[PDB]
Each structure stands twice: as C-alpha cells, then as structure tokens.
Amino acid sequence: MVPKADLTIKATGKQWYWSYAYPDNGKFEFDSLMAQDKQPRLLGVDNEMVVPVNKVIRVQVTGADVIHAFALPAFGVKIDAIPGRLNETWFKAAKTGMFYGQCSELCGKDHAFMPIAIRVVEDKEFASWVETAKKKFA
Ligand SMILES: [Cu+2]
Ligand SMILES: [Cu+2]
Known about the structure:
The chain is mainly β and 138 residues long. The chain has one domain (1-138): Sandwich (Immunoglobulin-like). The protein contains one helix and ten strands, in the order E-E-E-E-E-E-E-E-E-E-H. The strands form two sheets. Strands 3-2-1-5-8 form a five-stranded mixed sheet, with no helix packed on it. The protein has a five-stranded mixed sheet with strand order 4-10-9-6-7. One copper (II) ion is lined by residues 68, 103, 105-107, 111. Residues 4-132 form the Cytochrome oxidase subunit II copper A binding domain. Cu(2+) 2 binds at residues 103, 105, 107, 111.
C-alpha cells in the first residue's frame, strides 16, 4: 500500500534519461540528463529531482518508449517504468542530502547512463527551488 502522500512527482523513463513532473507544485516538468562534468561518476545530472525532507513523496513511474525501471537503493525502491502503465511507489527521506539510483531494466545503448539523482532539502529551500523551477521550466 502507498501511504498518504505529502506530494507527488511523476518520473518518466526515456531512452536514456528521466523526466520529472510536479503535479502538486504548478505542473512543471523537466528532463534530468546525465552530466558527469559532475560527481559522482555515472550518477550526476544537470537537473536533479528536488524534494523536501521528512515528507511522504509519492513517485508515479512510467516509461515513454521502452520499459525502464526506477531503482533508488537508499530507500528500498525498485519499480517498473512501463509505457502505457502508471505504477506508484513512495519514499520518505529522513535527512537532507543527495541520493542516487539507476535504471534497473536493460533498455538499450545508454541503459547504464540514465541515473536518478534526488536532492533532499528543507521546506524553505524546496519552496524557493519550486519558484525558480516554475520559471526555468516554463
Ligand atoms: Cu532505462
Ligand atoms: Cu535501462
């Protein structure tokens, strides 16, 4: 069962990146593309999924092209991202910081290079980030 959520984010797997939509924060969406100009190697991206600490985050998970899977080991999360299907999982981060995962379903050439990067922040910073993101992402 998915517990009562404080916020929902939709994570859509694509060849070979994730898109994150924020239905509860103004319906903006952005792509999260591997950077590696950035540490850690194979895990850093241009635009992280930002979430508030100490909140139930429902993650709706789907794919856009082929089957992917959303894996976030620090939270015990692993769920298929199947095009045509909206799956759901969740996590609650007990502390701030960076948390990383990977696509866990072989999905072609760049499967190994579509990381999930989550930045957990306090409420104040989350709200400030949302302000900026709404403008950045359109
Ligand atoms: Cu994939
Ligand atoms: Cu994959």
